[PDB]
Design a protein around this ligand. Structure first.
Ligand SMILES: Nc1ncnc2c1ncn2[C@@H]1O[C@H](COP(=O)(O)OP(=O)(O)O)[C@@H](O)[C@H]1O
Length: 294
């Protein structure tokens, strides 16, 4: 057996990811082991096929795979810094808007690689942004179980996802385009800066009805301390009409990212982690019992 499976690293809707050591080298990998439900096998094979299609510094790379009759295991590149939110932002007291723009720009470079070859990610959430080394700042995007080739002139519905991060076209059961990923980028950015999800309802059903209606605002006081460009970036992505949203290349040209090409001023506003901490605690609980998708 080539891999020594160690501690749980995280969990998702298709399985649990563990630390794995390749015996013959001592190198560390991540082992994703699917839950023992045979209907998950197509998603695991999709993830494998997708990961073998990409080759980009901001997308997790595949390594090995094997299976039993029931269950598939995927061995993949280990993001050794763990999850951006759980393992990096939430071990600090404060972060800045400039930090978040640095992470989001890298997320967009990974997405742009995917979009350029005709593939939508389809399932981006705050847990899918990983950091490659302990204490580092290089983003790795993961979880391609739902990723798919998109024909912009022959759209299909998306029937799966985490309710707090889907788009209105998903809730209304309409065809889903690349602009769905862009909606999710706007929502992740809103969550990372403001520390709350503007569509969160009391339960999954209510969250979905809030997304379906599509209304949100910058009411919390934190937003008065976020730059105009940052609020503008979000507001060009969280648009109900999918065709009005910025595409990935336009998003990458947005002036919000101009601050990354200038010296880190000694006057960046310091955003406390308490709000994000509270939302993450809620978000994490959704994964306590496998998955509640469909
Ligand atoms: N390559 C990886 N490196 C480090 N941790 C990972 C990796 N892949 C997954 N994880 C951990 O597992 C968590 C959930 O995995 P996810 O991609 O949502 O799997 P699935 O949805 O297929 O069950 C991630 O948020 C992360 O903590």
């Amino acid at each position: 057996g080539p891999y020594d499976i160690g501690d749980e690293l995280g969990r998702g809707t298709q399985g649990i990811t563990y630390h794995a050591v390749e015996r013959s080298s001592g190198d560390n990998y991540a082992a994703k082991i699917m839950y023992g439900r045979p209907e998950l096998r197509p998603f695991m094979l999709n993830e494998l096929e997708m990961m073998n299609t990409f080759n980009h510094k901001n997308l997790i790379r595949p390594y090995d795979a094997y299976d039993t009759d029931r269950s598939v295991t995927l061995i993949m590149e280990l993001a050794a810094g763990g999850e951006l939110v759980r393992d990096n932002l939430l071990r600090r007291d404060y972060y800045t808007e400039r930090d978040i723009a640095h992470y989001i720009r890298q997320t967009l470079w990974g997405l742009e690689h995917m979009h350029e070859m005709g593939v939508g990610h389809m399932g981006l959430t705050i847990k899918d942004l990983l950091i490659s080394v302990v204490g580092g700042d290089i983003i790795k995007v993961s979880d391609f179980g739902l990723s798919r080739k998109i024909n912009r002139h022959n759209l299909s519905t998306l029937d799966y996802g985490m309710p707090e991060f889907v788009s209105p076209e998903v809730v209304n059961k309409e065809g889903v385009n690349f602009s769905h990923d862009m909606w999710t980028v706007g929502l992740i950015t809103y969550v990372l800066l403001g520390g709350h999800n503007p569509f969160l309802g009391i339960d999954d059903r209510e969250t979905l009805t809030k997304i379906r209606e599509g209304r949100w605002d910058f009411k919390d006081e934190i937003w008065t301390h976020i730059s105009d460009d940052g609020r503008d970036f979000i507001s060009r992505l969280l648009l109900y009409s999918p065709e009005e949203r910025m595409d990935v290349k336009t998003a990458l040209k947005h002036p919000w990212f101009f601050m990354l090409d200038r010296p880190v001023y000694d006057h960046d506003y310091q955003i406390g982690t308490d709000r994000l901490r509270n939302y993450y605690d809620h978000f994490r609980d959704w994964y306590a019992n496998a998955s509640c998708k469909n």
